[PDB]
Write a protein that binds this ligand. Structure first.
Ligand SMILES: O=C(O)CCc1ccccc1
Ligand SMILES: O=C(O)CCc1ccccc1
Ligand SMILES: O=C(O)CCc1ccccc1
Lengths: 536, 536, 536
């Protein structure tokens, strides 16, 4: 159970609540609760005293010059939900909305937001009950409009607000009746407390980072399989090389490779600096093998940097104005700008493209007899069935997906419109669509990694057959990559045996079904993910 | 003075040597000098014993399958200079080439490259004598070809090598004569020791990072001028706001802006928390002022991350193979792949475009009476000459430059050709052209920042006039921005005066001349750079 | 000789005047010359009568709300030169500036601009005398600022204007003195007549289109060399194939390749339709040969479309307001927006990157023995000197240039700033920087094509040798590609000979010198350009 108010949330915390339905509860720490209440009292007294506060006793953004009376102060926040009910396009994944709610709640616990504890708690109840508001993919320039949908569902403002109640679509007032809750009415500032901020884009981004850390670990395993299938050397990953060029990510990737290849019987074992003289001539490994740590270093380091930045944002107070009860003051600031998210997700998409292109080049070596060091063309299985073309179709599909991934590696934060919202929002982060685009990259990268996994699994079977009599690669692989191999072969439903490789005749499988099954297992955190669990 | 190989080099160190002609010397540490010699010993014995070593007793890259005898091993390295080099197209700044020679020599001191000390010393001599080999902008997929022009010049291989000898173009053999040096012939491995590696792209990147750090400080100062001109508040930068979203770069940007604005007579001083008129009523600032530290944060942190990555690359051993004397072995590795440089410069150009775009929307506020809070249209000075249009042309020029900077913020590392060099280099970093594009970005950004300074300086004069009798902003400005303001007007040669603003009639200056003077001063590290020295 | 305004100007016409110094003269057509005078008459009466006309009796752009009297109307135009111009940063090729003055003068002959004939004649005098005003590369969001440097120079406004007087830098007033001309002062509207419009960006674009058409022809010739070197078939270009997919550009590319390859002794001549060995068995060509006309088609048609669009822009009236003498009226319109240029150059740069990428994969086939069908590795000439590595360095340099060209194939028109010039210019074309980026693209492409020519020439020599006794490819080549081959080797100064290929030892040339010579020749319209003259 994740406790919200007392500690810092991690990306892993957010993914557990978001995807695994881990329960959540608000802290009962007495000072935190008091800070929450103090914040509301300050706002209550300011409104009554006719203190002028943008968005609380006056209008919003470019219409903040519009005066709002005390009698209309609550109605201002309520109406904020209505004129923001303007989303468009497809729905977010529920897991992203759950993440959004968890972050919104966390942000309120700091007590600078002036929102009722009963309203914070409503997010805890939705999360634990399995109620997820629908939220559209269009509407935020980086999260008013997405958040208004969460807000209107929480307070049950109107039947046009829809929720998913454990797989059941229904309207929000109906959901409140089932939970035995009452409709809520927003008090001054509460609308801004719910809707001003970065919770959705950061929630999306958090899940993207989690998914990409996992996909990177799996990618490392694929490369390890590729290297073993190509009969490449492990000399490339020797600590002496990387200690003298000590980028943290290069160091890490090289050292992870040593572990991944340790006790393999398929690599050239040359860590003593000397050629093994076991095949018919001396081979040098191409750059995609030799320069693998240098290439992945900045990606590994970048993802780690994004993860650090996204975790600050997770634990940030992001609405506005901010209430300082210690000095009885409020400040008109800008924490609702999700610039670390916009730029971070630009970087992430770019990194995913770089990962994919490197993997596709490995596949090009495996598939091509000129470069595969003895592997059959296109990793053909049954040689006596001449019509067999092996994994030729699977490569083309790989070739169709990677460039799309580099395409999404283009940036969007730099294309923000400077005329936005009556020229009030003349900079903005484009963080929201940047995050949804990242979700798209990650989803596509999951299919891509599935394909790469299939190539590596076939390939080590065929290499094993070259080295030994037979096709069961389990004995021959390094123990670390044996777990992944076996996990893939389990998920796909094709057991390793000494007499057949993973793929034998083109006739005997739909490769598409194997792609879908591996992808689904990666996304679910199945045995493939668990196989590479130790690569942090 | 800068001692090469007993201490890590910083980016400041590199810029001092490259730009300011700081003297350089090789360490006399007895241990270091033995490492350098032991490395040569190992190699020249390995070759004499007929060990197979790629690139040393064998051909290069895709032609590593070609065996090279004991007797041709030396000529192998000499010929590498001929086919490699002399593949080049257009021409790079001498300071970048000086940076490269410093980096190359620095990497050799580690004692793993198997290169003669007198070859290393020749880079020291060239640096202190001011002999700079000509290097072309095309030829490296990320430094064989660039480094070979340096190598051919150092050893005085042929008259077709041009150097710049403190201003004098010469052929290299002639430069050697005047320095009283003999030509050198490369021994086995020494060609690779000179031409394998990331020294030139990293040399370029290092100067770019240094310049971009300077421009970020100046940009901070420009924003501080803009805010004062616009009668903005300092409330947005209150630490209560930023402590509750504690990204390091955001915290830093807000704190710096507090310092930059302290004791200004031109800002609305609302750090109390409460409002009221010295203008309209209540005034709400637009996002480009209010969300400034949120926006600059990831740019600041990003430049800092690149800085840290480039300093590691600066102090790395990047040639190949690497000689490990303690275990008497060579390793065929890949430290010549400068992925941190190709990706880092992709990020740098992207950050610079975001800085420029933000500055440009401040210029839009300043120029437009709807948004300037009482400044004249286009920062017009003499309103009585009605044909005056003020800084309208200056704005258009700004508007033409900023989009070009976001254009250069496109990435190039992801567009690497997988068929490079006989399909041997099937991944590569594009780090060299990434770095020269960054240089182009930085150079354009110096022009842009010049314009933005001109806008800020004019504007505070006009705001001062609105407020007081006069046009001399020096007394009204925060002391921090007064330093910058005076420095700018010192450079353009237009003295502050209580009777006239910086720009009075359109008649009286070529603004093009002011831009050029301010840019030159920024490039030379002049008084404008010295005014913002405080900003780390 | 080129007569300005009684005939449409073509892109050939523009290049002849800009590059070859062709003499120019204004039409003496009595009707045209009356139109020009009637236009001035209308305007100078309208002003004298106090008509409100934007930019004529009122301020400019966002300051059009400022009224300008009869008495200051002339000074209004003179001052436009001062605030506009003199907003500029870095410097453009004289030929582009000559193109601009031709275009500007050409637009005035239509008689709708209200500008004095002696002002128009001054562009004629400058062109024929070889006086070229200095113009900077920054300042236009797509030509006020560039055109104002031309204007100030033409009228001799101030010594701060520099011109190039056939090689001599001068101030403009001094150039006027030597030409025996008086300074001019602008009359109402004449400033706009000179500085409103798309003449400079279109002048640049025109030279780019001309150069790109040349390089496309040369590229066709390079492919024809590549195909012959690779022992490719001409079957792929059979009209039965292309008639059944009849895109004009594809039809054209296939037919041209048939001509380029006719009577070659180096291709497999399979236009019959049936196969067989003069090699392996049956040989299938890869897509870069087989799909060549399908690939080049849209590039060819695209360049042709741009050509047609630019010629309309060339012959357009682009200033404002436009005087319609027949109805005695002015129209406030928008012909100064050069969207066809900003978008056309976006497309051009994109096409050029696609041409380069295609050429680069041919170079990969040539360099690699797995794919070259029997050519030596890296097109090595003297195989007995084992330290020779042939064109390996040349390939790497090619590999560094091509990705930069696809990089410049990114677009800039979509990145226009909507806040430009007091929010008056809330759309703009970015046409000027689009065009200067195209110039940068074209210039880099000339270097790239040089490399590709060097590869093709070497390769056919080596293929000829495989086939016959000797290295002289002249007899074996199709007559069409023999012209190109000889032209290239004339330029680099290495005569075909039966005993030695173009490149024998790495020892014996600086390949950098060959690239530079071939590029210079391509730029100057030399023998290499004349060899491919036949390709329309
Ligand atoms: O704080 C601001 O400047 C904008 C707040 C806001 C709230 C709801 C809609 C638009 C803007
Ligand atoms: O593969 C390598 O490590 C060397 C590649 C290379 C290519 C051309 C010249 C020197 C080295
Ligand atoms: O809006 C227009 O048509 C003119 C814009 C303009 C701006 C600055 C100088 C001349 C014209």
């Amino acid at each position: 159970n994740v406790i919200i108010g007392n500690q810092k949330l991690t990306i892993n915390d957010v993914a557990r609540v978001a995807r695994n339905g881990t329960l959540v509860s608000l802290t009962n720490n007495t000072d935190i609760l008091q800070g929450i209440q103090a914040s509301c009292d300050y706002i209550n007294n300011a409104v009554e005293s006719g203190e002028p506060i943008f968005g609380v006793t006056s209008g919003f953004g470019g219409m903040a010059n519009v005066a709002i009376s005390r009698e209309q102060a609550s109605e201002l926040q309520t109406n904020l939900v209505w004129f923001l009910k303007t989303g468009a396009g497809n729905k977010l994944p529920l897991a992203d909305v759950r993440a959004a709610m968890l972050l919104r709640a966390n942000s309120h616990m700091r007590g600078a937001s002036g929102i009722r504890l009963e309203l914070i708690k409503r997010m805890e109840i939705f999360l634990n009950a399995g109620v997820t508001p629908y939220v559209y993919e269009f509407g935020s320039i980086g999260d008013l409009v997405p958040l208004s949908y969460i807000t209107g569902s929480l307070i049950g403002l109107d039947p046009s607000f829809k929720v998913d109640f454990n797989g059941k679509e229904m309207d929000a007032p109906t959901a409140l009746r089932q939970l035995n809750l009452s409709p809520l009415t927003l008090l001054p500032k509460e609308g801004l407390a719910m809707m001003n901020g970065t919770s959705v884009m950061t929630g999306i981004a958090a899940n993207c980072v989690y998914d990409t850390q996992i996909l990177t670990a799996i990618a490392m395993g694929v490369h390890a399989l590729d290297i073993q299938a190509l009969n490449g050397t492990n000399q490339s990953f020797h600590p002496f090389i990387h200690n003298s060029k000590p980028h943290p990510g290069q160091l890490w990737a090289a050292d992870q490779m040593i572990s991944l290849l340790a006790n393999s019987q398929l690599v050239r074992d040359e860590l003593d600096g000397k050629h093994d003289y076991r095949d018919h001539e001396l081979i040098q490994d191409r750059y995609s093998l030799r320069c693998l740590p240098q290439y992945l270093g900045p990606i590994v380091d970048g993802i780690s940097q994004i993860a650090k930045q996204i975790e600050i944002e997770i634990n940030s107070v992001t609405d506005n104005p901010l209430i300082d009860v210690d000095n009885q003051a409020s400040y008109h600031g800008g924490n609702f700008l999700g610039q670390y998210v916009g730029m971070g997700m630009d970087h992430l998409r770019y990194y995913i493209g770089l990962l994919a292109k490197h993997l596709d080049v490995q596949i090009a070596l495996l598939a091509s007899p000129e470069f595969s060091n003895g592997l059959p063309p296109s990793l053909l299985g049954n040689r006596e069935r001449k019509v067999n073309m092996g994994l030729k179709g699977l490569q083309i599909c790989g070739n169709s997906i990677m460039p799309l991934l580099t395409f999404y590696g283009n940036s969007i934060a730099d294309r923000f419109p400077t005329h936005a919202e009556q020229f009030n929002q003349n900079i903005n982060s484009q963080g929201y669509t940047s995050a949804t685009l990242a979700r798209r990259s990650v989803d596509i990268f999951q299919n891509y990694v599935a394909i790469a996994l299939m190539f590596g699994v076939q390939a080590v079977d065929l290499r094993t057959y070259k080295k030994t009599g037979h096709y069961d690669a389990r004995a021959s692989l390094s123990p670390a990559t044996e777990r992944l191999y076996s996990a893939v072969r389990h998920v796909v439903g094709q057991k390793p045996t000494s007499d057949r490789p993973y793929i034998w005749n083109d006739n005997e499988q739909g490769l598409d079904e194997h792609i879908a099954r591996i992808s689904a297992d990666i996304a679910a955190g199945g045995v493939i993910v668990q196989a590479v669990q130790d690569i942090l």
